[PDB]
Write a protein that binds this ligand. Sequence first.
Ligand SMILES: NC[C@@H]1O[C@H](O[C@H]2[C@@H](O)[C@H](O[C@@H]3[C@@H](O)[C@H](N)C[C@H](N)[C@H]3O[C@H]3O[C@H](CO)[C@@H](O)[C@H](O)[C@H]3N)O[C@@H]2CO)[C@H](N)[C@@H](O)[C@@H]1O
Ligand SMILES: [Mg+2]
Ligand SMILES: [Mg+2]
Ligand SMILES: [Mg+2]
Ligand SMILES: [Mg+2]
Ligand SMILES: [Mg+2]
Ligand SMILES: [Mg+2]
Ligand SMILES: [Mg+2]
Ligand SMILES: [Mg+2]
Ligand SMILES: [Mg+2]
Ligand SMILES: [Mg+2]
Lengths: 24, 60, 98, 155, 120, 127, 78
Amino acid sequence: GKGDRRTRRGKIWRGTYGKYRPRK
Amino acid sequence: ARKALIEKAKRTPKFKVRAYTRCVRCGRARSVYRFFGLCRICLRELAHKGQLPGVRKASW
Amino acid sequence: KIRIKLRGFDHKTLDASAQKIVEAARRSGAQVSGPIPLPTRVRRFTVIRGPFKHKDSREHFELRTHNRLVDIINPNRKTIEQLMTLDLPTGVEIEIKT
Amino acid sequence: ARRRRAEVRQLQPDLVYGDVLVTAFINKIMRDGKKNLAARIFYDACKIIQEKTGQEPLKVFKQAVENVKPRMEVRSRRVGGANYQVPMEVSPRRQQSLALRWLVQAANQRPERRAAVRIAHELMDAAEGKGGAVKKKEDVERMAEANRAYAHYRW
Amino acid sequence: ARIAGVEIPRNKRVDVALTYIYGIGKARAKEALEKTGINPATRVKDLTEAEVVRLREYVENTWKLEGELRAEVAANIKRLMDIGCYRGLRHRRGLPVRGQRTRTNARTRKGPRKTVAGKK
Amino acid sequence: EQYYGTGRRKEAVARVFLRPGNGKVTVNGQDFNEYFQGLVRAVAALEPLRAVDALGRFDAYITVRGGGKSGQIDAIKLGIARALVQYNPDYRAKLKPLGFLTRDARVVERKKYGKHKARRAPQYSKR
Amino acid sequence: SLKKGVFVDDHLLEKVLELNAKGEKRLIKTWSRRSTIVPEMVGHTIAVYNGKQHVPVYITENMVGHKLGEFAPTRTYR
RNA sequence: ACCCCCGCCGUUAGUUGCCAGCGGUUCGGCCGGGCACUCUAACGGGACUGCCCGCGAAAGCGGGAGGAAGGAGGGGACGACGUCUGGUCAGCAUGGCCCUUACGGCCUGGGCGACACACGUGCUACAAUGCCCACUACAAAGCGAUGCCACCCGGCAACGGGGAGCUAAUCGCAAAAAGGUGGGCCCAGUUCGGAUUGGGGUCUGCAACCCGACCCCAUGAAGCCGGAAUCGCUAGUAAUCGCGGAUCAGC
RNA sequence: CUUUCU
Ligand SMILES: NC[C@@H]1O[C@H](O[C@H]2[C@@H](O)[C@H](O[C@@H]3[C@@H](O)[C@H](N)C[C@H](N)[C@H]3O[C@H]3O[C@H](CO)[C@@H](O)[C@H](O)[C@H]3N)O[C@@H]2CO)[C@H](N)[C@@H](O)[C@@H]1O
Ligand SMILES: [Mg+2]
Ligand SMILES: [Mg+2]
Ligand SMILES: [Mg+2]
Ligand SMILES: [Mg+2]
Ligand SMILES: [Mg+2]
Ligand SMILES: [Mg+2]
Ligand SMILES: [Mg+2]
Ligand SMILES: [Mg+2]
Ligand SMILES: [Mg+2]
Ligand SMILES: [Mg+2]
């Protein structure tokens, strides 16, 4: 999970934001 | 090299990203706290002496 | 109407310096919302003790900016005398606002 | 424990049936500090005891445990040459811990895909006397006693 | 049923099942399941021939896939051989391509391990 | 008209006001059961009431901010207890033996340098 | 990877453009491996420094998007 | 022991706290108003084996009450004479020896990033006590005017346009995540896992081939819990979940 | 248990 850029969790861990984790 | 270089790092350079920090005492590139211009070493030193104001042994 | 922020590294030279600004406005004027102590900004620095490799083993330093606040509501000129230049700043900061 | 004999960590009674032994179990169920999910499971499992029998869950669990407690075990032992398996009686604490340890390991060996179920069936099977827990146990009581020649150490 | 190249997804949800094509990930599946207006939850097993067509037509024509790709990608790397670029060697050598370390790791791109000798 | 206890447990503080009569409990402008929803542990926070038979012969209004929900629960547990002792000298005899009155000063211990985590040390090889 | 320029060294361009106005030279050597090969400035032979010497990289059409140093490999037997 | 942090209470203090009380509320402590409470930060109090039972010559030991807290309450800071000819002359300082159109200097470029291999420390896993998607306040240390960027709009997005507030308990980074509520997957090398690789982009920077991070499409490797060996942890610990900082253009 | 050498 945490290692997957295309999950939401992958994003969190990576600190990033994107399609798979939007800013509200 | 550490003389020709304490000198070079003060010169304003072509491109600001060639720029960098240096312990203004102990003339040194690495672990250089920007709030002081001070190398972790030449710093623990002053911090001990009382020559860094309000700075104190943290203990919590 | 008048607002004064007080910074400083030393907590005795605020609870002193700015608790004497409570007498130099109460005696020579009107109302004061007493000295109010603010959240302090702790800075912590963490240093490898030795000059060369001993990466576990460190020393821990903080640098603690204490903040205090005072508010005076009625601007007399009987007050802005001590509160103008009857000077005892020492190692203290002075912010003056309205 | 070189100095003292260690205080038996004393446990919050149960939120629901009011019993200490239950928290103990919920705790062995619990991973990574997730007491909530752990407790859902044990309660969800207690509800599966209801629907699949007119039995009160509490006294199923009680009596399952009582069936998984070993009487004797074999602790390994140096004899200035050889290590032998030495049979000896089992502290009431250790009875109780090993029981609940095995209940949950037994539970999680099962096929059923959902934790509350595995917990439930294993419990059922155990009160009856035929859970995987009880085999991992008659296995122990067997091995001690099948080493009864060395009962003349005990240390 | 059969969709592209020669693929036959089956029995599972379509969103999943589309994935079974070389060219379809979880994303391109969403795209083509609303651009044809098919509920994604429906199993392939039970989804209209009218739906299968809508789908099949969009897919084969919207973007390059299965086998066409397989040969394209292969031809990009062939192209990287050219007169002889850097990423060329790397593909030529069976070594990593994206600026990674090789002193350790790099196993995904290398023959399991080829252990040797050494030392006195 | 009013009853008060301040609860704390581990970064959580519990501002607790009891009232006479009904039985129902507000927490941060919310029913107890919709705030502590799903959280098995919650029924413990009111354990002080069941102790003295206050069951539901009081309402309660509670603000509770800080820390965490298991913490909040225990903070309350404490307020609720500190509240009704301050509305009955005699509510020690039942509430102290079960120590709903104790603070419980167990708190997150500090990350140390050298260590990974307070105590978890790093890992020897010696080879 | 950029999109507002191709960040190519003028000292090379300038020397290549003002060779294209009549210019078919091979003794064109550079140290700017960091510059993109620019729209069809092909045909020519640029020698690129790997940090030890210049290597003649013959520049053709298929390889235009790329950088120059992609053809001056810096390390030996890899 | 004398010092700092954390547990309980008191005093002093009201641009952070509040229907706690009552009033108005476009129902956001937002508005007049109020420090009660919470907190913030300064100063005090509090614990002494002082009190009760038992043992003891005594120190002290077991138990009990009161108390937020007992018998070192919990975490720091704090390292005897000395040991290792330990470590560092590459932080600095410094005795001696050696280089002085070079063992000094400046630059561009490459290298410190090599890869047939071996080891240490780590991350992500190998799944259903789980994975995915949506909704849903748990709260808790720090940073921010060559800065933190709310809010609008364009872009699937990274990011790009604009643009308010904040020298910051006032404004921003900030979503905490685990949890909770619903929905999906149904035990599959899988909707587990996210290596590798093709392609398209964004940003910092003179410049991202050798060498950056990020986003998006595609591609989905090994991996089904690990041989002999072997590591940490005794409680708010381990286990697990996110959050901040320093250095720093970016990483 | 086990331990020759260094
Ligand atoms: N000021 C020096 C610093 O102290 C550090 O802390 C060290 C010690 O003070 C600390 O304590 C030791 C521990 O080392 C050792 N392996 C086991 C022992 N039980 C610990 O002692 C423990 O108990 C004592 C007294 O009860 C405490 O005061 C002590 O700090 C605590 N860590 O553990 C650390 C080393 O294992 C480091 N020694 C050192 O890197 C650093 O220089
Ligand atoms: Mg995945
Ligand atoms: Mg730099
Ligand atoms: Mg380390
Ligand atoms: Mg922790
Ligand atoms: Mg080689
Ligand atoms: Mg030596
Ligand atoms: Mg150079
Ligand atoms: Mg290196
Ligand atoms: Mg499997
Ligand atoms: Mg010999």
